[PDB]
Amino acid sequence: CVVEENDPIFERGSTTTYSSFRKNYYSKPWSNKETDMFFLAISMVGTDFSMIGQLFPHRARIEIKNKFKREEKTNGWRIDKAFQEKRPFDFDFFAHLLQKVLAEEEKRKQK
Amino acid sequence: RCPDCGSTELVEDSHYSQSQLVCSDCGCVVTEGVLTTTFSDEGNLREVTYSRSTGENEQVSRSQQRGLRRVRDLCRVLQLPPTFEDTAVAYYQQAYRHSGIRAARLQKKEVLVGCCVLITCRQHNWPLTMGAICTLLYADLDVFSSTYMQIVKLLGLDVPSLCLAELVKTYCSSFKLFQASPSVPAKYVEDKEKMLSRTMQLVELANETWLVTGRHPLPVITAATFLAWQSLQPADRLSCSLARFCKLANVDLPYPASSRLQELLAVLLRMAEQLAWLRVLRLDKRSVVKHIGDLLQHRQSLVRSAFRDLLLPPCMLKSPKRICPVPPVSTVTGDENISDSEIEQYLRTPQEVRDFQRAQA
Amino acid sequence: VMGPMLDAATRKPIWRHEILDADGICSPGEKVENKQVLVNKSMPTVTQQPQYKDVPITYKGATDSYIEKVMISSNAEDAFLIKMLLRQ
Amino acid sequence: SGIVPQLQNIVSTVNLGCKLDLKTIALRARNAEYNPKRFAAVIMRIREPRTTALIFSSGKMVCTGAKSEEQSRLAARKYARVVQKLGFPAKFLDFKIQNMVGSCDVKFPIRLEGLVLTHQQFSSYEPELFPGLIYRMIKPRIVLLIFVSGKVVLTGAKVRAEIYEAFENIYPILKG
Amino acid sequence: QPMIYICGECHTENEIKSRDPIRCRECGYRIMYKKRTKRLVVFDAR
Amino acid sequence: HECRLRDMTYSAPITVDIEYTRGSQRIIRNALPIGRMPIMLRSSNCVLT
Ligand SMILES: [Zn+2]
Ligand SMILES: [Zn+2]
């Protein structure tokens, strides 16, 4: 037997209810410097979504997928420019830049 | 026909409780007497149906029985007449003839029952939002919509359009503002008939002004009934808001109800600009609600004048100068092979392959 | 319910259909004799083309009667209740 | 009608007539994705025509995103040459247009109720689920998505002429 | 042809076509009678 | 009298308030119908009283 662990709740008047028919999957927004580091990560790794998702603890795989698709639909020229230039594969310096961006956003939140 | 004269003018006439056929030309009877069942016998004998006779009504697996029982209890809890239950079970038995339908998961059968009862209540002009049906189904509305589309694409039955008048008649009565319950101050109470009429006029103004196409009805109906409740006593209600009204009425407010309310207020303002006295008042989005009566009184000429200067989503009304840019014609295909360095850029190098293998080793 | 059966020869309703109004329902105030029809009701025989059999409502009565009023109404089932008050 | 539709997506399948090893092409390619845990096919993206295609071990290949039959043929040939460079005897055999999606506009509003009332047997309009009206003209077997904004989308055709005739036939129905 | 009726309690002269829901204009009533016939009817003083 | 004319049962809805645990969470309803009770004429609830 539970000793006052839950609180009563009113839920549904058993009456006409609104037809939502929508599930708004929460998608974390994208920051400017975050978008820049994501673009350089693309340029360094290519179009491998698994590696990008692995090296992105602040984001999800579907989020990276949608961002890449939107950039292709909107900023395909920048995508091609990034795909033209190359840079040595950076897994460690990429983590260092991720920590730097984390500190930058923490500072921006402090302000 | 007449056996002797050949006249085909045989007429049925009622004699002193005797049914008989007599020719009008020669008055000769061709057939008399009739055999009918008596009540004492009709009460004892049992009627038989074609299905049970041919052996049907026994090929009803556990799943189809569960489905029809679900349909029955669903149409029962809604307090529908027996004709609706009969039509729903008939539509279910008709939809269950497909091989892909019977062979489906519980969610599929449940959403199928929901869509069947929806179609049923739709035909005999009974409005019922899908939300109110999904509220009694142990499933989500996202799969319900997809299955509804799938079945209406397969069955192609008649699907009348949801009437806005009956929808308002059904939805307006759900509000508690009509009675002076202990939880509602007496000031907010209103007459149900006047409120219904005002909301009907408001939604008609919305219907003619392109505010029912594409957008869900419920938010528009809520905005209209809120504006009506406000205009009936602007003194003690203009200070309130849509959220306050919804909380007072104990009704979940639709999310886009705010946008619909704003659009309707803008339409009302544009209409008031034509009326000399209102245009002199120089009203605003808030003070316009009180004059809704005069606007609705002459809504026809007002909306005609407003459309003489249509309604579209605000995203495309930001005065697009370039509407559907023509892409450059580049359907050329080189000779056969434009370049090969592209594959050199798309291939993976040994170092890159090793780095990839090491990343997720 | 069909309207009155207008006779081709006389361009008028037949005797069995004399009391029926245009809508196919007997109108109040008229007199009714035996075997005459009060509602020219027709049922669908199916429950593909519309097939309708005539099942008129007749006045099985000993003597002449009078219709004082006729009320028509609808239940939630959409069924039309048609009642008439015969007076002697 | 004074208006010509704009083809946006072309669909066409091509058989390579040879078996493939998905892992080999997925390992030796940069623009190739392969996640057999969810989908057992290789996804490849070509940049110049801005199109994407799917590759299967059975030798069947399909392309999407092209705008014209010539661009789809070019993309199919590009993918075949790519597969050949990975050490496979891929061939360009049984190429045929399967579907094409095009968009257009009428520049005037449309009443989604009058159309479904006059052409009920040809359309299934349900605004409670999706705002755009769905019209299914049976003669060319074309499915049209119609919206209040006047813009319309067409799909199901096999040749540009079919999309053009569908648009020119639906235009007077919308104007009415 | 205008097929006309009378409503329940305000006696509004309601011409309605077939298949129409039974409603009283200027009201909301749903009970409705038929008007009286126009044809001449002979009655006997007996 | 209207119920007399249209051949209907002169009744009133029966409301009830309930509480239940669908998912180990207490949810209550305030006015849930459970049926219709016929109303005897000239009784407490009959409109004629
Ligand atoms: Zn004879
Ligand atoms: Zn009245």
UniProtKB/Swiss-Prot annotation, chain A:
It comes from the Eukaryota. Induction: By Epstein-Barr virus (EBV) resulting in the stimulation of the EBV EBER genes. Phosphorylated by CSNK2A1 during mitosis, resulting in its release from chromatin and suppression of polymerase III transcription. Isoform 2 is highly expressed in cerebellum. Residues 22-72 form the Myb-like domain. It is found in: Nucleus. Disulfide bonds: none annotated. It is linked to Deafness, autosomal recessive, 112: A form of non-syndromic, sensorineural deafness characterized by postlingual progressive hearing impairment. Sensorineural deafness results from damage to the neural receptors of the inner ear, the nerve pathways to the brain, or the area of the brain that receives sound information. Component of TFIIIB complex. The TFIIIB complex has two activities, alpha and beta. The TFIIIB-alpha and TFIIIB-beta activities are required for transcription of genes with TFIIIC-bound internal promoters and PSE transcription factor-bound external promoters, respectively. The TFIIIB-alpha activity complex is composed of TBP, BDP1, and a complex containing both BRF2 and at least four stably associated proteins; YY1 facilitates the formation of TFIIIB-alpha activity complex. The TFIIIB-beta activity complex is composed of TBP, BDP1, and BRF1. This is Transcription factor TFIIIB component B'' homolog. The gene is BDP1. The chain holds residues 274 to 384 of 2624 of the full protein.
From Swiss-Prot, chain D:
The chain holds residues 159 to 334 of 339 of the full protein. The lineage of its organism: Eukaryota, Metazoa, Chordata, Craniata, Vertebrata. DNA binds at N9, R45, K60, N99, R136. Its main location: nucleus. Widely expressed, with levels highest in the testis and ovary. One of its GO terms (biological process) is RNA polymerase II preinitiation complex assembly. It is linked to Spinocerebellar ataxia 17: Spinocerebellar ataxia is a clinically and genetically heterogeneous group of cerebellar disorders. Patients show progressive incoordination of gait and often poor coordination of hands, speech and eye movements, due to degeneration of the cerebellum with variable involvement of the brainstem and spinal cord. SCA17 is an autosomal dominant cerebellar ataxia (ADCA) characterized by widespread cerebral and cerebellar atrophy, dementia and extrapyramidal signs. The molecular defect in SCA17 is the expansion of a CAG repeat in the coding region of TBP. This is TATA-box-binding protein. Keywords: Disease variant, DNA-binding, Host-virus interaction, Neurodegeneration, Nucleus, Repeat, Spinocerebellar ataxia, Transcription, Transcription regulation. Sequence repeats lie at residues 7-83, 97-174. It comes from Homo sapiens. Belongs to the TBP family. It is found in: Nucleus. One of its GO terms (cellular component) is male germ cell nucleus. It comes from the Eukaryota.
From Swiss-Prot, chain E:
The chain holds residues 13 to 58 of 58 of the full protein. The lineage of its organism: Eukaryota, Metazoa, Chordata, Craniata, Vertebrata. One of its GO terms (cellular component) is RNA polymerase II, core complex. Signal peptide: none annotated. It comes from the Eukaryota. Its main location: nucleus. The gene is POLR2K. It is found in: Nucleus; Nucleus, Nucleolus. Belongs to the archaeal Rpo12/eukaryotic RPC10 RNA polymerase subunit family. Component of the RNA polymerase I (Pol I), RNA polymerase II (Pol II) and RNA polymerase III (Pol III) complexes consisting of at least 13, 12 and 17 subunits, respectively. Pol I complex consists of a ten-subunit catalytic core composed of POLR1A/RPA1, POLR1B/RPA2, POLR1C/RPAC1, POLR1D/RPAC2, POLR1H/RPA12, POLR2E/RPABC1, POLR2F/RPABC2, POLR2H/RPABC3, POLR2K/RPABC4 and POLR2L/RPABC5; a mobile stalk subunit POLR1F/RPA43 protruding from the core and additional subunits homologous to general transcription factors POLR1E/RPA49 and POLR1G/RPA34. DNA-dependent RNA polymerase catalyzes the transcription of DNA into RNA using the four ribonucleoside triphosphates as substrates. Common component of RNA polymerases I, II and III which synthesize ribosomal RNA precursors, mRNA precursors and many functional non-coding RNAs, and a small RNAs, such as 5S rRNA and tRNAs, respectively. Keywords: DNA-directed RNA polymerase, Metal-binding, Nucleus, Transcription, Zinc, Zinc-finger. One of its GO terms (biological process) is transcription by RNA polymerase II. Disulfide bonds: none annotated. A zinc finger (C4-type) spans 7-27.
Curated annotation (Swiss-Prot), chain F:
It comes from the Eukaryota. Signal peptide: none annotated. It is found in: Nucleus; Cytoplasm, Cytosol. It is linked to Leukodystrophy, hypomyelinating, 8, with or without oligodontia and/or hypogonadotropic hypogonadism: An autosomal recessive neurodegenerative disorder characterized by early childhood onset of cerebellar ataxia and mild intellectual disabilities associated with diffuse hypomyelination apparent on brain MRI. Variable features include oligodontia and/or hypogonadotropic hypogonadism. Component of the RNA polymerase III (Pol III) complex consisting of 17 subunits: a ten-subunit catalytic core composed of POLR3A/RPC1, POLR3B/RPC2, POLR1C/RPAC1, POLR1D/RPAC2, POLR3K/RPC10, POLR2E/RPABC1, POLR2F/RPABC2, POLR2H/RPABC3, POLR2K/RPABC4 and POLR2L/RPABC5; a mobile stalk composed of two subunits POLR3H/RPC8 and CRCP/RPC9, protruding from the core and functioning primarily in transcription initiation; and additional subunits homologous to general transcription factors of the RNA polymerase II machinery, POLR3C/RPC3-POLR3F/RPC6-POLR3G/RPC7 heterotrimer required for transcription initiation and POLR3D/RPC4-POLR3E/RPC5 heterodimer involved in both transcription initiation and termination. Belongs to the RNA polymerase beta chain family. This is DNA-directed RNA polymerase III subunit RPC2. It comes from Homo sapiens.
